[PDB]
Design a protein around this nucleic acid. Sequence first.
DNA 1: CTATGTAAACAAC
DNA 2: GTTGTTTACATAG
Length: 85
Amino acid sequence: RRNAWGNQSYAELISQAIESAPEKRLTLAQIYEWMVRTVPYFKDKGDSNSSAGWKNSIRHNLSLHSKFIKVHNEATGKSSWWMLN
DNA sequence: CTATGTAAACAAC
DNA sequence: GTTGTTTACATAG
Ligand SMILES: [Mg+2]
Ligand SMILES: [Mg+2]
């Protein structure tokens, strides 16, 4: 294992999360939820705040890679939708 | 040198 | 306390 959760890179995990959504878009909190619900290593980490290393790494990847695109979200108290490409 | 993971400064909310 | 962008640095290859 390249990482504690497997060989997937964070970009690959985020990509799988987005692709699993029916409308192919998820908010940042939803990407974290997908990790906690689906990746064994993260199953006992839902109780963490945003300073958690892995959450910071997710945010870093979303901004760094052009493959992740940010779209405005109409829902009043919710953040941006993240999509692929 | 590049890809990747990790940490943190910093803005804006 | 979160969301988002960014620099900085470490290491594997
Ligand atoms: Mg991006
Ligand atoms: Mg060393």
